[PDB]
Design a protein around this ligand. Structure first.
Ligand SMILES: Nc1nc2c(ncn2[C@@H]2O[C@@H]3COP(=O)(O)O[C@H]3[C@H]2O)c(=O)[nH]1
Ligand SMILES: Nc1nc2c(ncn2[C@@H]2O[C@@H]3COP(=O)(O)O[C@H]3[C@H]2O)c(=O)[nH]1
Ligand SMILES: Nc1nc2c(ncn2[C@@H]2O[C@@H]3COP(=O)(O)O[C@H]3[C@H]2O)c(=O)[nH]1
Ligand SMILES: Nc1nc2c(ncn2[C@@H]2O[C@@H]3COP(=O)(O)O[C@H]3[C@H]2O)c(=O)[nH]1
Ligand SMILES: *[C@@H]1O[C@H](CO)[C@@H](O)[C@H](O)[C@H]1NC(C)=O
Ligand SMILES: *[C@@H]1O[C@H](CO)[C@@H](O)[C@H](O)[C@H]1NC(C)=O
Ligand SMILES: *[C@@H]1O[C@H](CO)[C@@H](O)[C@H](O)[C@H]1NC(C)=O
Lengths: 434, 452, 434, 444
């Protein structure tokens, strides 16, 4: 047992949450079954008592030796010291919920005999189940699988509650009295669960209710089943939509682009190039644009994400050794990412150079039609646009992207307008140009 | 004498006290009109509740003739102008249609038609105004939306149940299988049995389940197909409204999880390092546990300017009274800075400014814990806390040392710090009138080159 | 003569031609599948079919002489209209539908595009868009229910009457022999099959089983279409109230996070209640972006000429001046007891009062020197000098037309005599008070 | 050799191998469940299954020679393709879907079903290659419905065979009666039972035994999960079919709600509803910068020069100077649609925009009266001197004429500072435009 248990990287705490969730599932899914069905007989009573003793020992351990060791933030810094952790846990709502759950009504077993209606307080500890749901959804990679399994488990649990309530209604009416109640010839829980499915899904086909308690029971059960089936529709549609929203948004944008290009009669070569661009963007980047995902973040995590991806390239280049770190940070923040299809011309000989290109996951070639030097990933080209004022110079070669080159663009005017701050960097880049 | 404010709480208590008998009028007046046994058995109770509803309706026309409205921004209190504005309104025509003294007709027919009190239902606009005010007042809007939709479809199910019992009374009882059975049987003769089986019929039809006996006559066939179409549209309304409630309950959690999954996809594509992965994910976990994931300007872009400035006061000045420099500064620059503040959040181990960069931002700590450090690792010179400031000397470009306007040190964040950003351009644009900041920051430059 | 396709006469013609098309669909499938509604009212369906064919050939002539738009203008060359209509497929559909047992008239259903264009034109022009969407949806599912009823009676006639238990019973028996009983039982069977309730008698033959399978799959997809359209109706019906409730909720949870004072939060709730009671949830700049610039200017010059006919000092400007004004005037609303500008404050804004009573005051003292009402404006002397003149307070829920510095600077170009006179009046008030 | 996974040869092959996978799933398992059907058509199923096996052999033989993308270019080393294909789990699925197990029980041939990723790849490639994408998505979900209906019909008939035939009321009836003994009625009644159970209508005969009770509970559960998961998906697809007209209807009823609230006059009401009806009748409601904001500059400008070509190639001076200049300008262009009887320019307003006329006619109208000086058709331009701001002329720095609209015109707006930063690199076209401006000044 460690001195202070955190939430983010404690797999032992996740296994403890799984054990507390298992004990809470035992109580909340076997208290109505043992309450209504005649399964708590004198023969299995050692099994049920030892299960409730094991679950209350798990509850007491979670009260005493795990939850007063949970780390938390107070005023910005994390809190490690144990007396303050204990006071922070003991002033919380989880502590009063757990102590309200652990009120030992097994001392009423001597009073009114064996009855699991007194054990209903162990269903009050739902916060441990919800934090287990949040932790597994935090660490899983495909969380929608677990969300679909949890929605299925919620539907099976509410059907089990409806089966227990139907068996209570049949025992209150008398087994086999009318035609609505459970007649008692097969498996009791299986036939009552069949009744619960064909009532709560609002299927029907069951026998018609005869007397007034059965009529108001079927009324309330169908009226709750309409909302339960509606919440099942809503939860399944919401979970699957939140699963596939990224691919659905990308497919909607591709469909709108193809609808525009066919609404204004664009030829098949350009439609093939746009289709190939969208397919390679989905196969490579898995998203539409990265700049829209960056510009909703804070600026310091934007700069951290930019430096961590591009400092390797911008330091691998030998021409970028004499610059300064503030130049590197601002220029790596303001880099614009672009993608060129194979066979395209990034700079044709005779055009004015206005962009400084950084190669990242691409293979380009400078060319008349004979190759001069192929550039690998992490290379650079387009340095002659550092001294061009207005028009300035032209592009001195035909540099052709050979494969699916993913260039990083850096403009001329932004380069000059931050470069005027640094005369030493401007001087060493001019000496590199000379 | 007094004129009631329509936005006061006494007006809302009146809306509750007048939305009670209108809802009673709807529900139990269609019940009393369709059954004629629940009308007959509890006649004294229905007489005293109808007298209560009539005196509350008279009190409602007396209140609506005495409430004021807003014209030219002012609240009128002239009772003659209020009576004229109420008299030239269709609500007055509805109230004088609703307050027809049908005691004369009730004693004239002989108390077999409670259909003569169906003009009392015409204050439905008052009930809808109560539901609108409770929607804009209450603290559980999803729970109130579900309760309002359940009350609407319960009124619809009760109305269709009473319509089915009136149709079976019109075709007669137990002649065929679809209608209500022969009511001379004492098992089918209980009033609660009548109402509960008729409500069971109405829910089985309007909930498109349909375990009822199949119709025989042509009017029963036509009523069952019209009722099934109304029921399938009501079921579509229930599924759509429950889906809207489920989306409204967790749309913020869903868009936050979508942003986390999208940035996780971006960081798994661009092969960032794993400590940066854990830092950004713990950062988003801290922003969710901090109840601060949306930016305050995107919250307050809908607000007017003085109200936005008052929220800026109520959030920022309780920290800005813990300062050590604005004791010799004035309230004009306090309110200008509180207009110019934008909060940024940081992570533990993250640098604010290193040694020797040209920064142009000033920062105010708010619920953080920062420290100036050297480049040798953790050598904390002094820990700064809430109510401090740094980065003020490098925006005026003053000298007196060999450095200029360069950040003199490394500033890291120990905990989950939360700063208030103040850049050069906005602060030097808005602060053009006060030299108190000029003399205080000149003293700051003099003493920072003293300790430098 | 040429008919304007966006006129009102063309919409009257869409109504006059969408009545017999909705006749043709409904009553041709009913007559053709029932064979007694045709045989009873023979002269009635004959004269209505003659009227429907006359309206069809008039629609052929109207679509022949209806004008279209090239180069943004109306084409009145009726020969060009003839060739433009003749090269389209709508002309081929019309001459297909005008080709001379009511099952031989099934080509009259080919003019469905006129009914769909009528429904789209009404969904554009009417003042109840969601009510018309509900009416169109119920009309679509009633057409589907009626067509399925006719199809069920046709399959029952093809298999024989009263042989099985699934088909319609024996028509020689007068209980099932009447036409009203036949039509209402086929309608009841198709409501039961398409809404997927399933209280129909079970099928016996293989063709009946296959038809009930195909019909239940069609009923599942139609019920999903009804659920989706009514959910979309609910969402776009309550979207505006839901987004303002989300704004209110974001405000309220942010202030619950930051522990707002009671008077300031009561002012916030009173402001949102004033908004909800005076129906200013609509945002002018957010909703008028889809209009062109002059159409943005003309509604604005209507409402702001209604507010500028009240003022007296700045009415010397007319068309151009106010056209540049109603373009760049924006509204802000102020609470009661609110300050517009104080003593020691720099001026940057002019205001025009509409629907509000403002009073000037002394230094923290309520003294009504002059009560500014509708008919004046204020706040222009402190921009063409120092600091704002004296405190300005709000009596009630006042609404102001704010005006930036750039606007009046741009307004100094045209009609300068008025502005120099009013700044002389500014100097007048300056020499008055100091 | 090597095949391109983005070509048309790989897609035609993908269709030719997605056919026997779907045959194997449906047909194969339908035959199995119906042992009697197998008995009746044995040589036909043996011929079709031998064809499916040789297609699976050629499937793994052509997946051993398909290329992938490393460093953005096509790899073509066949040994590298074989190593990269051996180092995945899809090849393990092709190995286990190829074993020769078999003519009496076709439950032994279920290894052929394992090539499901190939059919799913076919559905995805056809979805992104068709011209009716949402209609194909509805068709794909309908085909999934029919697969699940057929599979549960086969499962219901097989569990009826395992429990016995005609013993109960829930099970399939006695086979030796010639009415229920037909194979067509076997398949059609099992299809009816599974349609009812999976769409949760539930007018089947109720179960009597506990195995049947558990099967109907499980079946029901699956149906209510499955249909809600897939039939709801169809509902979502519908909304995607109607979404563009729905958002244009949201714009029109928000505008009409505002002008019903503000009590706007009926002439301007009819004018703005005529303008919105014109926009939806000419189908120019899709905002092209918002719909192509994701695309890069080269593809945006190639889309623009292939849409606006016939009314942009009518320019005199800036036609052959610099095609890249023209590319940058048409990328930076911005279209607006004007009403008839609308002023584009007035005497004395500050100029910030230049106008390229596209599919419309504008007339230079006088200061006081309506005298059409010259009508300007498509391809021409105006509004350049007030954004050039040059010395030597009268130099009023305002708009020097009145430009009115006779019809529903469309223009190309472009900003003054946008043209300045587009022509700071290129001064030759700027001095040509400048010369034109000077000439205009001289004239008037
Ligand atoms: N011509 C040329 N350019 C190169 C070479 N290697 C890198 N580059 C860059 O490629 C360029 C393409 O555009 P520029 O003419 O603008 O300028 C050229 C150089 O900056 C090389 O071997 N030849
Ligand atoms: N150098 C220094 N800066 C301090 C100290 N305490 C607070 N600060 C602020 O920390 C700063 C970090 O950035 P600056 O160089 O801009 O300016 C410095 C000061 O404003 C201290 O002891 N030394
Ligand atoms: N000083 C002053 N301003 C007035 C008076 N009546 C109306 N106003 C307006 O009130 C103003 C408040 O702001 P300004 O100084 O901008 O300019 C002043 C005038 O335009 C008056 O009697 N005195
Ligand atoms: N002044 C002027 N402009 C003309 C004439 N014919 C066409 N135009 C265009 O009309 C214009 C109106 O706006 P601009 O001042 O922007 O520029 C002017 C010219 O481009 C003409 O005869 N005189
Ligand atoms: C109803 O019951 C009474 C007596 O119980 C009987 O006389 C009458 O005929 C019955 N009516 C019908 C329609 O069955
Ligand atoms: C229907 O009834 C008539 C006489 O009523 C009879 O001749 C005919 O055979 C019946 N139809 C069938 C299908 O039995
Ligand atoms: C099926 O029919 C045959 C012949 O009638 C009979 O021998 C057999 O018992 C029947 N099976 C069942 C399960 O009834």
């Amino acid at each position: 047992l460690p001195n202070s248990i955190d939430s983010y990287t404690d797999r032992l705490y996740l296994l403890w949450l799984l054990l507390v969730t298992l004990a809470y599932n035992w109580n909340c899914c076997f208290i109505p079954l043992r309450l209504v069905f005649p399964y708590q007989t004198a023969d299995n009573i050692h099994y049920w008592l030892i299960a409730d003793i094991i679950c209350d020992i798990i509850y007491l351990y979670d009260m005493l030796f795990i939850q007063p060791r949970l780390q938390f933030v107070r005023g910005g810094d994390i809190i490690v010291d144990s007396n303050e952790l204990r006071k922070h846990y003991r002033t919380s709502t989880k502590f009063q919920l757990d102590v309200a759950s652990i009120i030992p009504f097994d001392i009423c077993y001597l009073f009114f005999g064996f009855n699991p209606m007194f054990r209903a307080n162990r269903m009050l500890k739902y916060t441990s189940f919800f934090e287990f749901n949040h932790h597994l959804e935090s660490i899983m990679d495909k969380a929608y699988i677990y969300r679909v399994i949890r929605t299925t488990g919620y539907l099976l649990f509410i059907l089990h509650i409806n089966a227990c309530v139907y068996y209570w209604a049949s025992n209150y009416e008398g087994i086999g009295t009318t035609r609505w109640v459970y007649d008692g010839e097969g498996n009791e829980y299986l036939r009552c669960y069949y009744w619960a499915v064909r009532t709560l899904i609002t299927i029907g086909g069951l026998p018609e209710p005869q007397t007034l308690f059965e009529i108001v029971f079927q009324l309330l059960n169908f009226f709750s089943g309409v909302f339960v089936f509606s919440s099942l529709i809503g939860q399944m549609r919401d979970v699957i939509g939140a699963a596939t929203a990224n691919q659905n948004y990308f497919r909607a944008c591709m469909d709108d682009t193809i609808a525009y290009m066919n609404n204004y009669s664009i030829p098949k070569l350009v439609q093939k190039r746009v289709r190939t661009w969208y397919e390679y963007t989905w196969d490579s980047q898995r998203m539409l644009d990265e700049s829209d995902l960056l510009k909703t973040l804070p600026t310091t995590v934007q700069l951290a994400l930019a430096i961590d991806v591009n400092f390797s390239i911008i330091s691998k280049v030998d021409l970028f050794k004499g610059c300064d770190t503030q130049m590197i940070y601002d220029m790596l923040l303001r880099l614009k990412s672009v993608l060129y299809l194979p066979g395209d011309f990034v700079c044709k000989k005779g055009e004015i150079g206005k962009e400084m290109y950084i190669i990242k996951h691409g293979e380009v070639q400078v060319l008349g039609t004979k190759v001069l030097v192929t550039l690998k990933a992490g290379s650079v080209f387009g340095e002659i646009s550092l001294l061009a004022a207005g028009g300035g110079n032209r592009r001195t070669a035909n540099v052709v992207a050979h494969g699916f080159a993913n260039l990083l663009t850096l403009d001329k005017k932004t380069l000059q307008e931050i470069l005027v701050h640094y005369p030493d960097s401007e001087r060493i880049l001019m000496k590199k140009a000379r | 004498a007094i004129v009631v404010d329509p936005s006061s709480n006494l007006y809302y208590r009146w809306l509750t006290a007048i939305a009670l008998p209108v809802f009673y009028n709807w529900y139990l007046l269609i019940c009393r009109a369709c059954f004629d046994e629940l009308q007959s058995e509890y006649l004294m109770l229905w007489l005293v509740l109808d007298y209560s509803a009539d005196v509350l309706y008279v009190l409602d026309v007396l209140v609506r003739a005495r409430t004021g409205f807003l014209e030219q921004g002012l609240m009128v209190s002239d009772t003659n102008r209020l009576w004229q504005h109420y008299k030239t309104t269709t609500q007055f025509k509805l109230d004088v249609l609703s307050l027809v003294p049908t005691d004369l007709a009730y004693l004239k027919v002989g108390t077999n038609y409670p259909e003569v009190r169906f003009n009392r239902l015409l204050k439905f606009s008052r009930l809808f105004e109560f539901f609108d005010r409770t929607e804009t007042r209450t603290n559980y809007p999803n729970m109130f939306r579900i309760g309002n939709l359940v009350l609407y479809i319960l009124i619809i199910i009760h109305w269709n149940a009473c319509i089915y019992f009136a149709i079976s009374k019109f075709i007669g009882f137990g002649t065929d299988s679809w209608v209500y059975p022969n009511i001379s049987i004492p098992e089918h003769g209980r009033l609660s049995r009548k109402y509960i089986y008729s409500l069971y019929w109405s829910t089985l039809t309007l909930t498109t389940i349909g375990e009822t006996p199949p119709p025989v006559k042509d009017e029963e066939y036509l009523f069952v197909v019209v009722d099934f179409l109304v029921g399938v549209l009501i079921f579509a309304t229930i599924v759509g409204n429950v889906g809207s409630m489920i989306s409204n309950m967790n749309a913020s959690r869903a868009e936050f999880q979508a942003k986390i999954d999208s940035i996780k996809q971006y960081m798994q594509f661009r092969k960032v390092t794993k400590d940066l992965e854990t830092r950004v994910i713990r950062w988003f976990d801290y922003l969710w546990a901090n109840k601060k994931t949306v930016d305050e300007k995107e919250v307050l872009k809908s607000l007017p300017d003085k109200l936005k400035a008052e929220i800026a006061i109520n959030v920022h000045l309780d920290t800005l009274k813990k300062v050590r420099i604005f004791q010799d500064c004035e309230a004009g620059l306090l309110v200008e800075l509180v207009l110019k503040l934008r909060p940024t959040v940081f992570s533990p181990g993250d640098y604010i400014c290193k040694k020797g960069d040209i920064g142009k931002e000033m920062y105010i700590i708010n619920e953080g814990k920062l420290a100036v450090v050297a480049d040798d690792g953790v050598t904390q010179f002094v820990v700064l806390s809430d109510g401090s400031y740094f980065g003020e000397i490098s925006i005026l470009n003053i000298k007196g040392s060999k450095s200029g306007n360069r950040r003199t040190a490394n500033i890291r964040s120990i905990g989950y710090s939360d700063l208030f950003c103040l850049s050069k351009d906005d602060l030097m644009e808005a602060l053009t009138e006060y030299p108190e900041a000029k003399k205080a920051l000149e003293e700051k430059g003099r003493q920072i080159l003293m300790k430098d």
